[model samples]
Target: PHAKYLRECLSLAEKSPPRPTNFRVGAILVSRKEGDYKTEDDRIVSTGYTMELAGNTHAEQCCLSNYAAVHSVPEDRVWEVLPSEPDRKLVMYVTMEPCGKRLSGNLPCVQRIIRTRQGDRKGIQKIYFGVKEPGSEGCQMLTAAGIDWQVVNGLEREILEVAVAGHENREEEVKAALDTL
Candidate 1:
C-alpha cells in the first residue's frame, strides 16, 4: 500500500518537463511498517528530506544535490533506506533512471532496488517511472543490471521543457555561475 503511493508520485514527476541541465531528483521513503510516518505538502524545501516529514516522505530520508541531481541515486545510500522493521518490506521509486558509474557517484536506482528485492523482497514487484531520460549510458547500464524498467508511454512535455527552454533566458546567469565555479 505504501509503495503504491510512491508509484503515483513517480508518475506525476515523469509528466513534468525535463530540465535542460542535469540535476538531482529525490523522493521520501515512507513505509508504515516502521513507525510515525509523515508527509509534507505545500511547504518550502531547500533540502529534499524536509518533504519526508509531512507524509510518506515526511520522516523519510532524502537525497539532495545540485551537481548530480539529474543523475542516478547512489547505490549504497538507496539500500540503507529499506524499511528497517522486521516484518514489512520497502519499495523505492525514482523519477529518472539511476546512474551507471561507480566512482562517478551515479548508481543505478534499478540495480539498487533489484538488489534489495533479491536479498529481501525478491525483485521489485512494482516500479513507477517515466521516460528514457535523454542519454545512452544510463539506459545501457540499467539494462545490464537486469532490471525491468518502463516509461509512461505518452505524456505531455511540461516542466523539463521549461528547464530546457529557460536556458536561453538565463544564459548569462548560467555562464556566470559556471564561471564562478
Candidate 2:
C-alpha cells in the first residue's frame, strides 16, 4: 500500500538526521485498500477533520505518521510492503507539492507520486484528484520531471502565482528599504 511507502520513507527520514530547526514543512499521505477510490475529497479534507485525521490510517499502522509529519524521505528508500514483493495495489494521495529542490521541509510530493507511478506502473490501480500543489519549487519539479499533472482550476494557479510574487516583491522591498533608502 502507498501508506507502506510513506511509512518506509518516514522511517528512512528519521534515520537520517535533520536540520537544527523546524521549517514548518510537512508531508501527508493518503492511501487505500485495493479497489478503494483515491479521490480529491479523500486526499485533502477541506474542513472538520484535521490533516492527522485525513492522512492514511496505515500511516499509524506502519508507525510512520509521526516521522513523515516531520522529516523528508530520501529518494532511494521505499516501503517493502509497498513497492516490493507481495505487492499490493495502492494509491498515494498527498497534500503538498512534490519537488526536487533541496529544502528542510519542502518536499516534492509530485516526484514521490512520479516515483510511485514509475515503480508501480501496473499494480498502482489508479490515481484520483485533489487540489494541485502550489507552484513552489516542488510543483515546478513536477513539470521538470516530465510528469503530466492536471490542476483543478486556473484560478488557484493564478492565486499561487500572486502569492509567490507577493513574497518576492516583499523581499525586494525589504532589501531595498534596508539599503539606506
Candidate 3:
C-alpha cells in the first residue's frame, strides 16, 4: 500500500538541492477513508520537496502549507485543511524523517505535526518515511505525540540514492571532460 505512494517520494526528493549535508527530502500528504482497499481509497492531498517554500522550510511543512493554500483552509487555522474525524485518516509520506529541530528558530516539523493533531481538527495521524535522519530524535518525538511513523521498509537505499542524486551529477560532469579529450 505504501510502496506505491512512497515510490513517488523519490521523484520529489530528486527535486531538492544537491547539498553535502543531505537534507534533500520530499513529502507527500494523503487522505484515506476507513474500510477495505478501494481503487480510490487513497488520494494524494499534497506533495512537497525540501526548501520548496523557503531555505529553512522542510518538506513536511511545505506539504501542509501547500495543502492549506490550495483548499483555502483559512489563514488563521490552516491546519484544519485536514478534517477532524475517525472516518478520514490523514497520512504524510516523506523521504526522510521530519525534523525535531530547526536552526532558524522556526517551528520544527515535528512540532508542526503535533500542532496539527491538536484541537478541533484532525492533523496528520500517520507518517511514513523512507530513511531516518542522522541523529534525529523524531521517532521518539512522533511516538510521544501519538503519531504513527515508520520507515517504509526496503526503500531506505532507493530513497538514499535519490537524496544523493542531487549532489552528484557525476556522469554528466564527466561527460563534458571526456568530450574535451
Candidate 4:
C-alpha cells in the first residue's frame, strides 16, 4: 500500500546532496482511507526531502510547511481533505523519526507536526517513520501529543540504505535512527 510513497521517499533521500553536519532524510504527506490503509485508498498530498526548502529544514517540516503556504487547496484545509471535512486525515511518512529536541531550538519537527491544525482536526493522524530509539524524547512528545506512529519494518532496509548514504558516520547520525525499530 505504501510502497509507492516509501519508494519515492528513498529516492528523495538518494538525491539529497550529502552534507557535512546534517544527514539527508525524506518525508511525505498523504491522504488516506478511513480505515485499514491500502495503496488504492491512499493519495499523495505533498512530498519533500531534507533541506529541499531551506537549510536545516526537515523533510516533514518542508512538506507540511510548503503545502500550507503554496498548495492549491484552501489554506484552512491544507491538513484536511476539505475545509469542512476531517474524516480522511493527513498522514506523514519520514525516513527518520521527527526530532523532539534540537540544539538549534528551532521548533522540533515533532511539535510542528502536532501543532498545525485547522479547527481541531488534529495536525496529523499517524506517522510512518523508518528508525527510532525506544523511550526516546521523540516518542514521549508523540505520546504527549496523542499522535500514533510506528516503524515501517518492511521498508527498513531501504530506509537505512538512504539514511546512511549521506552522513560521514553512518552509526552516528542517520544510522543512529535505526537502533530500535
The numbered model that scores best in TM-score is: 3
Model 4, 1-181: lDDT tens digits are 4555667788887767767556467888877767676767677777788788757777777777678767565334455632224557678888777889877888788877776555656567778876663224786788787888876666765676566665566655434444554
lDDT of each: 0.37, 0.32, 0.74, 0.69
Residue-by-residue lDDT tens digits, candidate 1, 15-68: 333334432233433343334434332121122321332222211134322111
**Candidate 3, position 149, lDDT:** 87
User: Using Cα atoms with residue i matched to residue i, what is each candidate's TM-score against the true structure?
Assistant: 0.42, 0.33, 0.81, 0.79
Q: List ranges where model 2 is wrong by over 4 Å.
A: 1-26, 32-75, 83-89, 103-113, 117-148, 152-181
List, residue by residue over 1-181, the lDDT tens digit for candidate 2: 3343333333323332222221111233333434444443333211110123332222111223233333454322333123322323444332123334434343333444455444434322233222243324444655565544333222322222222332435444334423421
**C-alpha positional error of residue 81 in candidate 1 after TM-score superposition, expressed in Å:** 5.7
Q: Over the full model, what C-alpha lDDT does candidate 2 score relative to the true structure?
A: 0.32
RMSD of 3: 7.0
Q: TM-score of model 1 relative to the true fold?
A: 0.42
User: Residue 31 deviation, candidate 3, in Å?
Assistant: 0.4
Q: Is candidate 1 or candidate 3 better by TM-score?
A: 3
Candidate 3: deviation at residue 29, Å? Answer: 0.6
State model 1's lDDT.
0.37
- Candidate 3, 84: how far from true, in Å? 3.1
Candidate 1, backbone clash total: 22
Ranking by TM-score: 3, 4, 1, 2
